[PDB]
């Protein structure tokens, strides 16, 4: 084996993860494993908190009743993402089990919410999970879930979630704290702080409400855009093509910690907003320009393992799964929508999927996901955020990425060429390992 | 332990070093350990170089006499930093032992210098340590020590260091080699070379002399500023917010090796100069702008361990203690002075202190300090500079950083919020792990 | 051993590879080891492909005849580089063995080519290595070899390579696929793709043909420049000072994978072109500006080990030998030619040579060379390219770098100063470890 008798250029590279060909059947097998797992870990039942006995007489129950505790909460913002993912997966795969799940959980929450409200009113206390639904106090308690409920209800008028949607959205649009200019804000950890996460916690709900409330379509399109641009003005870093995680209004400098998951939330927000805006919307160009600039900054920092780093621009920080999945979804979606180039980005998405699929264990858990994480102004905090299989943030994104990869693989015609994944818009009529595209 | 039954977001991160709360008492305990150590390793006595017998009849001694050799030289530029550090520490802590040390060493050097001069004149030879004091040949032999002597003498007219100050400063201002435009320069390793280190070796002395010589105040303020800006024009790299270690006038390109300690010296020079300049000094804005830009470039490159890298912009180069300490001092000082934002930078300084305190061993030595280091035009030289507990460069900076951290902690009200260090200007009236700041 | 009794600043650093002084004799010893090895692995004989029996009656042979297979192919583009390297090495060292080798191989190929053509015409098949020579189909099949043949023939009118040169160049200039604007291009892996490698596969041949065909000098100088600038417009990344490996015309974004070897090919192309252009050529300034900007971008990313990384701007990608060697050649050449500064770059080249020489094993093989590598749009492909001693790409560059380092060391007067390699244009009259340059 030498230069004269071997194509050294065709030697099998020693990848640590998987590389190369991907079939939509394999992607579906993997999201089905995650789906089967989360299905059994998100029970839609009321039980006695002391004995675990199933409660079915909701009119009679009291402060002993709670939602059965599986590994993941049904109405956390993390699960808001899962619900949106499964709505999308039903569409790209045609597997109605995915939407049956969302139907079932939403109908269950709609059914029981009023009874728990009555318990709270009579007893002064109830399941803390129900207080999140009934009395949200932050966009984290409302937006992602509200967004998914709007999406499904617009596909099914029989879905009885209007009461929940109105409650959630009344909080978002009328009660949530904002800066003087209206930008969704927090007073933690500092007064008048913007969190990159709130682009995603707040904007998709507003964008979807423009579709749900006919009377307020223009008003909500404009508010969704206004939020987007008021956040991006302050938080985007044009020199890097990345967003800072936080921005404190009083601070005279605004240090950038380009945390991967929140950068995922910003990329996903652009996708959610661009899914709704009319193609001739007058501010669409500015939003699209921001999206495209962010795509370029994020993708340049993909690691050799296909994952992205916890701090995106710090290649000594750990590789994190949930952000990686979010980016894969966004990139596949943007290619599918015609927003970004398939030749340039298809292989990025594909490699990212290989990376993510390698973290779906035999049980269907998603490994390597950063746990719930707030805002810091030092790098040690970010570098050392724990990872755990039970961090709920991994699940939605993996499902959504898989769903979108199936669409991408069913539309495009990727093929290995010279040992590299290449995207082709027409099927190449060759099995040669190295080839030129015909005229 | 899962998403439903655990706050995974409150799990204890597996830090390698310490993180979080810091009390001024702990900082003081640590600088006291360093102080006790250096006190016993910097003897202020004359001994016979052959027998070690203590010499007290200075009028009678000859070329056998030398300063007793402890681990660290009393009048090296490294110890010039230590003296300035201890002057500062006495002020922020109120511990007069720190200034007693400086008083003692300076009075000893003032006392013996004239006798060693007489030995040199009569015998043609004396202790090489005394030749550095009596006949300096480089800013390294004069500036940092002269600066500290001016600082203390202005606080104590009984301190008999005027002869030493005049000798040192005559060298600096009249004998030191300069470029055509007056910028302090060297002819090593190449003709007409600027060393970033000389910002610190030369400028603070000139700035302090403006305070010491009433007649020449304006002249020395102007020269200090002129040096600063003539160095920064050539050596600052605006695209990085960092300084190059060296600049050779003849070279048509000026490669940047952003060596951490010398970048510390440049940051410290800005602090020393800004401590002296009137707030309405006409060139102060340009100096402040340079300082602020350097702060932003340095802080962005802090590692996940709180240390900075030997080459700042090379995250594969070793983490170095002395530079880290210098940055901590500069950042705490700038916050204390109102030059930079506390919310943005307090946690940077605090993490850096945790990092540094972890390198103060039980003996009181400072580990991980880069040894004396000249100028190169290749990266291997910088990457492989040895570290040693006896590198004197670590001591001053750790003491000075600790002193300034005590001030910072006694003024600000930092507190953990959502597992991250946050700086508050008013004490928050809560022990909740996660909280919003009140209106 | 402490601060008072030891120059800690003069302690021996624990380098992993070699550092410091380099003699032209040592460099020559190392290239002689590589040369002896490749000499025995590149046999210039025809043999029966079944038995290995040497064939000397070329007029009588048939489709059984092939070039004897040693470890490296005689007319691959990799060996085109080797031939140019050895022409250069003969000049800087005066060792005629180097040019005797090239003479021998070129005369052998000139002698046998017509016989193999006759076999191909009569039998319909022949040695695939001869089909590359006789019927090139890509610049890889022609340019580098053609370039070397022109170079030697212009030094020796008796070298009977005009038929091969005309055949190769007819392909390059008239048959090779180009973009609409004339830029040499490929239709793999995508339609209308530019490969950074083709700067080197195509431009030097065109530049040399301007010297070989008197009638077409102006025409070929202009075409060489036009190619250079049409490639660089699209492929250079001014913000990084680096080139992207690929550029697909249809893509709306052009992702940058700054692959080290192809960046070497672009740097080498500038050297080959600048060797030919008149110093008053009207577009020379634009070419020189591109060269100088690339020098600055490449050199800033040299690792602490002296090697450069497989993806230049990804410090977590492997250190690669062939690119490193190419850069060393380019830098030494540019210093020797007066194009870049010796003080700034001599130590870069010198360290790079130490790095490369450490990969020349006792057998004379070159270790750590990336195998033949095509174009990807994901980083995993690049990060995981295999390395192999039989990758032919290492040999030419090491030889050429060594040859040019000998010239550099025989012209300049480098010397250790303060433990760092420093370049001096006049021999310094001192053996002191640390010194100032005299007035």
Spatial neighbors of A128 by CB under 8 A, at least 6 apart, are none
**Phi/psi of residue B265, nearest 5 degrees:** -55, -35
The length of chain C, given as a count of residues: 439
B219 CB burial (10 A radius; 0-12, 13-18, 19+) = middle
Structure-token pair, residue B115: 């006798």
* Cα–Cα distance for residue pair C25/A376, rounded to 1 Å: 57
Element of type H or E holding B403? helix B395-411
Q: Which residues of C touch B315 (CB under 8 A)?
A: 315
With tokens 């770059």, the residue in question is C345
What DSSP character marks residue B360? B
Q: Strand, helix or coil at B315?
A: coil
Exposure string of B1-15, with b = 16+ CB inside 10 Å and e = fewer, is ebbbeeebbebeeeb
Q: Strand, helix or coil at C65?
A: strand
* Cα–Cα distance for residue pair A192/A184, rounded to 1 Å: 10
CB spacing of C378 vs A350 below 8 angstroms: yes
C39 CB burial (10 A radius; 0-12, 13-18, 19+) = middle
* Cα–Cα distance for residue pair A183/B426, rounded to 1 Å: 26
For this PDB entry, the determination method is: X-ray
In sign, the C-alpha dihedral spanning C24, C25, C27, C28 is positive
The length of chain A, given as a count of residues: 439
* Cα–Cα distance for residue pair C22/B432, rounded to 1 Å: 64
Angle value at C-alpha C380, between C310 and C248, nearest 5 degrees? 85
Structure-token pair, residue A183: 């930008």
Residue A358: CATH number of its domain: 1.50.10.10
Name the nearest CA neighbour of A8 among B227, C386, B341: C386
Yes or no: say if A264 and A328 are a contact pair by the CB < 8 Å rule. Answer: no
Q: Is B432 on the interface with A (CB under 8 A)?
A: no
**Phi/psi of residue C277, nearest 5 degrees:** -60, 135
Q: Is C391 on the interface with A (CB under 8 A)?
A: yes
* Cα–Cα distance for residue pair C166/C174, rounded to 1 Å: 11
Exposure string of C388-425, with b = 16+ CB inside 10 Å and e = fewer, is bbbbbbbbbbbbbbbbbbbbbbeebebbbbbbbbbbbe
Yes or no: say if A15 and A44 are a contact pair by the CB < 8 Å rule. Answer: no
Which are the residues after which chain A is interrupted (C to N > 2.5 Å)? none
The C-alpha torsion from C351 through C356 and C357 to C358, rounded to 10°, is 100
* Cα–Cα distance for residue pair B71/B38, rounded to 1 Å: 8
Q: Give which of B77, B365, B378 to mutate to test C binding, by max C Cβ within 10 Å.
A: B378
Largest CA distance in chain B: 86
Structure-token pair, residue C222: 């202009």
Angle value at C-alpha A32, between A28 and A36, nearest 5 degrees? 180
Q: Which residues of A touch C79 (CB under 8 A)?
A: none
Q: Strand, helix or coil at B178?
A: strand
> Assign residue C241 a region: left if phi > 0, alpha if psi is -120 to 50, beta otherwise?
left
Asked whether the bond before B189 is cis by omega within 30 degrees of 0, the reply is yes
Structure-token pair, residue C45: 């004989």
Yes or no: say if C413 and C428 are a contact pair by the CB < 8 Å rule. Answer: yes
**Phi/psi of residue C435, nearest 5 degrees:** -160, 155
Yes or no: say if C392 and C79 are a contact pair by the CB < 8 Å rule. Answer: yes
Q: Strand, helix or coil at C360?
A: strand
Spatial neighbors of B57 by CB under 8 A, at least 6 apart, are none
H helices of B156-216, in order, are 162-170, 197-212
Q: Is A425 on the interface with C (CB under 8 A)?
A: no
The length of chain B, given as a count of residues: 439
Name the nearest CA neighbour of A100 among A44, A164, A147: A44
In sign, the C-alpha dihedral spanning B227, B228, B233, B237 is positive
CB spacing of C373 vs A9 below 8 angstroms: yes
Structure-token pair, residue C200: 């080197």
Q: Is B279 on the interface with A (CB under 8 A)?
A: no
Yes or no: say if B13 and B351 are a contact pair by the CB < 8 Å rule. Answer: no
C323 CB burial (10 A radius; 0-12, 13-18, 19+) = buried
Structure-token pair, residue C76: 């691959």
* Cα–Cα distance for residue pair C146/B262, rounded to 1 Å: 51
Yes or no: say if C194 and C234 are a contact pair by the CB < 8 Å rule. Answer: yes
CB spacing of B253 vs C304 below 8 angstroms: no
Structure-token pair, residue A358: 């390698």
Spatial neighbors of C38 by CB under 8 A, at least 6 apart, are C72, C82, C364, C395
Q: Tell me how crowded residue A112 is: count the other CB atoms within 10 A of its CB.
A: 21
* Cα–Cα distance for residue pair B406/B224, rounded to 1 Å: 29
Compute the 3-state secondary structure of chain B and give helix, strand, coil in percent, each to the nearest 5. Answer: 50, 10, 40
* Cα–Cα distance for residue pair A24/A413, rounded to 1 Å: 12
Q: Give which of B137, B189, B190 to mutate to test C binding, by max C Cβ within 10 Å.
A: B189
Angle value at C-alpha B193, between B189 and B198, nearest 5 degrees? 105
Q: How do A54-55 and A46-48 pair as beta strands?
A: antiparallel
Name the nearest CA neighbour of A211 among A158, A145, A277, A266: A277
> Which three-class secondary structure string do you get for chain A?
CCCCCCCHHHCCCCCCCCCCCCCHHHHHHHHHHHHHHHHHCCCCCEEECCCCCEECCCCCCCCCEEECCCCCCCCCHHHHHHHHHHHHHHHHHCCCHHHHHHHHHHHHHHHHHHHHHHHHHHHCCCCHHHHHHHCCCCHHHCHHHHHHHHHHHHHCCCCCCHHHHHHHHHHHHHHCCECCCCCECECCCCCCEEECHHHHHHHHHHHHHHHHCHHHHHHHHHHHHHHHHHHHHHHEECCCCEECCEEECCCCCCCCCCEHHHHHHHHHHHHHHHHHCCCCCCCHHHHHHHHHHHHHHHHCCCCCCCCEECECCCCCCCEEHHHHHHHHHHHHHHHHHCCCCHHHHHHHHHHHHHHHHCCECCCCCECCCECCCCCCCCHHHHHCCCECCCCHHHHHHHHHHHHHHHHHHHHCCCEEECCEEECCCCCCCCCCCCCCCCC
User: What's chain A's Rg over C-alpha atoms?
Assistant: 23
Yes or no: say if B34 and B395 are a contact pair by the CB < 8 Å rule. Answer: yes
DSSP-assigned beta bridge partners for residue C194: C247
Q: How many CA atoms lie within 13 A of B433 on its CB side?
A: 9
* Cα–Cα distance for residue pair B218/A400, rounded to 1 Å: 68
* Cα–Cα distance for residue pair B41/B51, rounded to 1 Å: 19
C302, C435, C437: residue with CB nearest B379: C302
Structure-token pair, residue B132: 């550095």
* Cα–Cα distance for residue pair A273/A278, rounded to 1 Å: 10
With tokens 């050539």, the residue in question is B234
CB spacing of C379 vs A295 below 8 angstroms: no
With tokens 């050294």, the residue in question is A8
Name the nearest CA neighbour of C66 among C13, C15, C133: C133
Structure-token pair, residue B151: 């600082």
Structure-token pair, residue B56: 């007290």
**Phi/psi of residue A373, nearest 5 degrees:** -145, 125
In sign, the C-alpha dihedral spanning B109, B112, B114, B118 is negative
Structure-token pair, residue A269: 């927000």
Which chains sit next to A, with 3 or more Cβ pairs under 8 A?
A: B, C
Structural domain containing residue C46: 1-439
Tally of domains in chain C: 1
Element of type H or E holding B319? strand B319-320
A13, A299, A348: residue with CB nearest C386: A13
Yes or no: say if A42 and A105 are a contact pair by the CB < 8 Å rule. Answer: yes
Yes or no: say if B47 and B68 are a contact pair by the CB < 8 Å rule. Answer: yes
């Amino acid at each position: 084996i030498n230069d004269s008798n071997t194509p050294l250029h065709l030697l099998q590279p020693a990848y640590q993860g998987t590389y190369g060909d991907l079939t939509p059947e394999q992607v579906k097998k993997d999201i089905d494993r995650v789906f089967a797992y989360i299905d059994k870990e998100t029970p839609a039942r009321v039980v006695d908190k002391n004995t675990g006995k199933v409660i079915t007489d909701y009119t009679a129950m009291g402060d002993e009743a709670q939602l059965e505790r599986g590994a993941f909460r049904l109405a956390s913002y993390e699960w808001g993402v899962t619900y949106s993912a499964l709505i999308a997966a039903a569409e790209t795969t045609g597997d109605k089990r995915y939407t049956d799940y969302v139907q079932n959980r939403f109908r269950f929450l709609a059914e029981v919410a009023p009874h728990f409200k009555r318990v709270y009113e009579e007893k002064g206390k109830t399941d803390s999970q129900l207080l999140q639904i009934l009395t949200p106090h932050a966009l984290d308690d409302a937006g992602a879930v509200c967004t998914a409920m709007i999406k499904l209800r617009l596909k099914d008028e029989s879905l009885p979630v209007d009461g929940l949607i109105q409650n959630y959205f009344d909080f978002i649009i009328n009660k949530e704290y904002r800066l003087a200019d209206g930008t969704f804000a927090r007073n933690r950890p500092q007064r008048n702080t913007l969190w990159l996460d709130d682009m995603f916690m707040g904007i998709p709900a507003v964008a979807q409400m423009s579709r749900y409330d006919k009377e307020a379509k223009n008003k909500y399109l404009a508010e969704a855009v206004k939020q987007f641009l008021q956040f991006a003005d302050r938080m985007f870093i044009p020199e890097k093509g990345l967003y800072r995680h936080g921005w404190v209004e009083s601070s005279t400098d605004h240090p950038a910690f380009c945390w991967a998951r929140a950068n995922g939330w910003a990329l996903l927000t652009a996708c959610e907003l661009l899914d709704v805006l009319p193609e001739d919307y007058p501010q669409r160009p500015k939003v699209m320009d921001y999206f495209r600039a962010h795509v370029r900054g994020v993708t340049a920092l993909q690691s050799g393992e296909g994952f992205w780093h916890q701090l995106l621009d710090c290649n000594d920080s750990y590789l994190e799964t949930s952000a990686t999945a979010i980016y894969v979804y966004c990139l596949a979606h943007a290619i599918n929508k015609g927003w970004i180039d398939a030749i340039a980005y298809g292989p990025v998405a594909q490699l990212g999927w290989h990376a993510v699929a390698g973290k779906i264990n035999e049980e269907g858990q998603v490994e390597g996901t950063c746990v719930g994480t707030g805002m810091a102004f030092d790098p040690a905090f970010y570098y050392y955020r724990p990872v755990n299989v039970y961090a709920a943030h991994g699940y939605g994104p993996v499902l959504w990425a898989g769903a979108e990869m199936i669409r991408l693989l069913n539309t495009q015609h990727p093929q290995m060429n010279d040992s590299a994944v290449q995207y082709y818009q027409e099927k190449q009529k060759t099995t040669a390992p190295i080839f030129a595209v015909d005229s």
